[PDB]
Amino acid sequence: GTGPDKLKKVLDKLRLKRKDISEAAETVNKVVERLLRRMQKRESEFKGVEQLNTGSYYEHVKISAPNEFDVMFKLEVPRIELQEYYETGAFYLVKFKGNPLSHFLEGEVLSATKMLSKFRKIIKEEVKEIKDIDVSVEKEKPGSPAVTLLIRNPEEISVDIILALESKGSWPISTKEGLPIQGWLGTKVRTNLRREPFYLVPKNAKDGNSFQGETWRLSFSHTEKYILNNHGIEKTCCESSGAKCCRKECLKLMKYLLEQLKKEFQELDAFCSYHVKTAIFHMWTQDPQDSQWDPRNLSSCFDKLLAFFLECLRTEKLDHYFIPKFNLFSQELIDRKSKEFLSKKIEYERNNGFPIFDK
Ligand SMILES: [Zn+2]
């Protein structure tokens, strides 16, 4: 019943939530594999699609909602020329240096709207041919670029399929000072990770417009997965012949704290798990030693993450780990009132034994 024991019990509660999630993931994977086989057999601009096995499930940090999954389909696109749409690196237009994607251009700019419309049309046709699993495509929602499958097993699982372009070019200059892992995972790892492809995911800016509709955000979901699964200064961190740390446990707890708060308070709508992930990436940089994340320090490590997060809220600053000029907590993206509200709620939990965990 002490504070430390209670936090360990929350981790036990999250451990129990995993079984339903793992079972659901196996059903999701069967459907997704079936669909990818169909899309790989059919002749189209999307024939080369593959699953990118990233996101919270494959990082082992999906803590809730066994009825909701996101999956990314990557498509290699040669000779992408990027234009920064926001010079922070928050958004890009895609242009090209014939061209396999020529049907989806609006002038020299790749239309996410056109490309996604065709993606959706094909998915819808091919899903109707999957006869031995109960699966349909959800009606398109304006402003939602994912193509959502509805699987009945017999319970309903929603799967959001996100198209990601893959570029094998050098990472965008907005990322030059990003991935600050040099004192933690080191310079050789950083070099190696930056030699890997990067991804572009459709996302509407919702700004002045014109090319509202045709903007893309950068995605490093592969790099993030690698970091989560290779997160120690020692190569053996959390392996069978190494020592456990509490890095992922702290991420899980903080994600759960935010999830529980968000369920109760619609004033926290603008926050999301990626804020917590980004914060913990910075914490792992700040405190690189595995000994700083000893399992015995679960409570103190959790508390330092909350303190760091509260300082990000106070300063309205949380830099994208890969794109340092992109401030996820800018005044423009999140109102001061929302940040002050979340600060208050976090301090309350922290000072009163985290009652919200129990809801
Ligand atoms: Zn570890």
Side-chain angles (χ1 to χ4, degrees):
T2 70
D5 284 346
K6 292 171 46 168
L7 207 59
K8 288 171 68 192
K9 188 70 191 307
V10 176
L11 284 178
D12 293 338
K13 179 185 198 194
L14 299 178
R15 181 183 60 73
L16 290 178
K17 280 143 58 72
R18 93 176 56 175
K19 298 166 208 176
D20 278 351
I21 292 167
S22 283
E23 281 188 0
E26 88 194 1
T27 303
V28 169
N29 182 69
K30 281 169 193 158
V31 171
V32 170
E33 289 199 326
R34 193 70 65 76
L35 179 58
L36 280 164
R37 278 191 289 281
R38 294 196 68 81
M39 291 189 68
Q40 291 162 350
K41 186 174 278 186
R42 183 193 179 120
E43 300 294 318
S44 79
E45 297 98 341
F46 302 97
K47 189 194 179 54
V49 65
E50 288 188 39
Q51 195 177 352
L52 184 63
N53 288 320
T54 64
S56 60
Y57 181 69
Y58 288 114
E59 288 170 350
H60 310 295
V61 297
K62 175 173 169 60
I63 57 158
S64 303
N67 65 331
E68 293 172 359
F69 284 81
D70 279 2
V71 305
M72 278 184 57
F73 283 9
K74 69 178 198 70
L75 180 69
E76 179 163 357
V77 177
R79 297 166 306 253
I80 283 172
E81 282 221 292
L82 291 183
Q83 169 210 310
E84 302 173 344
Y85 183 78
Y86 285 16
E87 285 191 85
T88 60
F91 292 101
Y92 289 83
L93 304 176
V94 170
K95 308 193 193 167
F96 288 94
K97 291 197 160 181
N99 180 353
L101 297 195
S102 64
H103 281 73
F104 303 145
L105 297 183
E106 188 69 48
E108 283 178 347
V109 168
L110 176 65
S111 177
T113 304
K114 290 173 181 193
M115 182 162 194
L116 285 166
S117 278
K118 194 83 170 312
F119 188 62
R120 177 184 299 284
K121 177 181 182 65
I122 296 173
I123 284 171
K124 279 172 62 53
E125 289 185 11
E126 293 305 322
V127 164
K128 285 169 82 146
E129 297 292 298
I130 302 173
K131 289 299 168 45
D132 63 349
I133 301 174
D134 189 351
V135 56
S136 67
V137 178
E138 192 180 70
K139 272 175 211 172
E140 175 177 8
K141 287 173 288 134
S144 289
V147 177
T148 302
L149 307 180
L150 308 171
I151 305 164
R152 292 150 210 99
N153 197 35
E155 68 290 345
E156 193 192 73
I157 308 170
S158 294
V159 184
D160 284 5
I161 303 176
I162 297 156
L163 174 74
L165 318 179
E166 181 177 70
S167 179
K168 288 180 156 52
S170 69
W171 290 12
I173 193 168
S174 69
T175 70
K176 185 169 37 59
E177 301 309 324
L179 192 61
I181 66 183
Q182 295 89 345
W184 169 35
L185 309 181
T187 57
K188 286 189 299 295
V189 166
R190 184 176 188 277
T191 290
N192 290 335
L193 289 178
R194 293 182 65 93
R195 284 178 179 153
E196 304 198 333
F198 66 96
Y199 299 84
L200 293 144
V201 163
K203 182 185 162 44
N204 272 352
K206 295 315 311 296
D207 79 325
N209 304 16
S210 282
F211 281 121
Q212 255 218 53
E214 306 329 342
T215 50
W216 303 76
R217 74 155 170 97
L218 296 182
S219 178
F220 296 98
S221 74
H222 58 321
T223 323
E224 294 178 12
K225 178 195 174 176
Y226 171 92
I227 292 173
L228 265 286
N229 292 344
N230 301 263
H231 56 244
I233 189 157
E234 300 196 10
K235 292 159 188 185
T236 57
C237 192
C238 296
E239 291 185 351
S240 64
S241 301
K244 272 288 288 147
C245 74
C246 68
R247 284 186 181 99
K248 298 182 107 167
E249 290 81 2
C250 287
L251 176 53
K252 287 190 290 199
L253 291 168
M254 187 77 188
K255 285 179 57 160
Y256 192 53
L257 178 60
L258 186 64
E259 179 200 316
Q260 291 289 83
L261 285 172
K262 283 173 57 65
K263 196 204 323 303
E264 277 220 59
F265 301 112
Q266 57 76 44
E267 297 93 338
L268 300 175
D269 280 359
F271 297 101
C272 64
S273 60
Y274 194 69
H275 295 144
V276 164
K277 191 186 202 187
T278 297
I280 214 175
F281 288 146
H282 286 301
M283 276 303 296
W284 291 340
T285 300
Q286 183 185 294
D287 293 356
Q289 295 293 332
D290 300 340
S291 59
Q292 292 174 285
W293 300 85
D294 190 288
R296 78 183 54 102
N297 296 132
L298 181 66
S299 291
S300 67
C301 292
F302 184 56
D303 192 73
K304 74 185 182 189
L305 171 56
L306 294 180
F308 176 81
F309 199 87
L310 285 163
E311 182 67 3
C312 294
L313 290 169
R314 184 188 74 77
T315 62
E316 304 186 78
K317 189 193 168 51
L318 174 64
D319 297 342
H320 194 290
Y321 196 62
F322 295 75
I323 313 161
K325 296 193 302 306
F326 178 21
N327 176 7
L328 310 182
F329 276 4
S330 68
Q331 303 164 267
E332 170 88 338
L333 283 178
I334 303 183
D335 313 308
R336 196 185 62 150
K337 286 170 185 170
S338 300
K339 286 166 254 191
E340 304 180 318
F341 187 98
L342 178 58
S343 309
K344 190 176 64 210
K345 293 302 182 188
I346 292 172
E347 287 285 38
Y348 181 80
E349 293 297 319
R350 182 180 180 202
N351 289 321
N352 294 277
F354 304 93
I356 198 150
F357 278 149
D358 296 337
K359 308 238 158 185

